[PDB]
From Swiss-Prot:
It comes from the Eukaryota. This is Cobra venom factor alpha chain. It comes from Naja kaouthia.
Amino acid sequence: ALYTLITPAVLRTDTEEQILVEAHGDSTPKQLDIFVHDFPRKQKTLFQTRVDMNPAGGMLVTPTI
């Protein structure tokens, strides 16, 4: 019932960065995708992945974008 997303304020490039996807109150396990587009228009995806968020992991997932 509360999905949060925490990235660094200034994302470096050519660097394996960590973000933080979190779900407070939901426990139905999910498969959820992360897309990294550009700002002004939806351009080519700079990154694209898929990570799974299960309550055995604590309903938080830390992808490596």
